[PDB]
């Protein structure tokens, strides 16, 4: 299949028409998305097949064809860009300054942007175009809007 670096839609025809269930990132021959998008199922790429390699429900991440490759991190200072890939719509960059999720196990960047569910797995980028994590695991805040963690894996 196509293994060119870039951002890809994750589609299914199991429902009415063709539906976009999420998004992911191809880098160094590995496909990276959020667990809740695929639930760890195998994927098709043209004639070829992508088998799961690593994943973790609590991190909400999964890699295919090899180990997680993305290791860039938010600097905690600068604006970033969400490369949103919404269902049925062209890739679009949205710039923002992250807030912070404070947890008992440390602080994580968060982005206050609200996109359809099928946008989960879209990459968040720093100024040099490196993927600092994936969009779509977050929380509903007091007023009913949405804020997403910047979720990043570990390169072992």
């Amino acid at each position: 299949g196509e293994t060119t670096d870039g951002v890809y839609r994750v589609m299914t025809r199991r429902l009415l028409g063709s539906t976009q269930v999420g998004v992911g990132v191809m880098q160094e021959g590995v496909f990276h998305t959020m667990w809740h998008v695929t639930k760890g199922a195998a994927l098709r790429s043209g004639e070829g097949r992508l088998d799961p390699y690593w994943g973790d429900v609590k991190q909400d991440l999964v890699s295919y064809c090899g180990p997680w490759k993305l290791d860039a991190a938010w600097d905690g200072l600068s604006e970033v860009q969400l490369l949103a890939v919404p269902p049925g719509e062209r890739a679009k960059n949205i710039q923002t300054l992250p807030g912070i999720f404070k947890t008992k196990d440390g602080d994580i960047g968060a982005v206050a942007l609200d996109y359809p569910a099928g946008t989960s797995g879209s990459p968040i980028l720093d100024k040099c175009g490196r993927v600092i994590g994936l969009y779509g695991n977050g929380v509903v805040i007091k007023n009913g809007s949405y804020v997403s963690a910047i979720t990043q894996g570990k390169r072992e």
């Binding site: 951002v7 890809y8 994750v10 998004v23 695929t38 790429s45 609590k58 679009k92 947890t103």
Partner: protein
């Protein structure tokens, strides 16, 4: 195998992109099922 992928673009920063969103500092918790909640 139901699910399939299709390329949507290169991963690049866009100069003069649309800017939106605020920057909330939120106390949160993460459960074993990977769900975030407010503290």
């Amino acid at each position: 195998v139901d699910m399939y992928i299709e390329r949507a673009g290169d991963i690049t920063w866009e100069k003069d992109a649309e800017v939106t969103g605020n920057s909330p500092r939120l106390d949160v918790a993460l459960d074993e099922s990977g769900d975030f909640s407010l503290v």
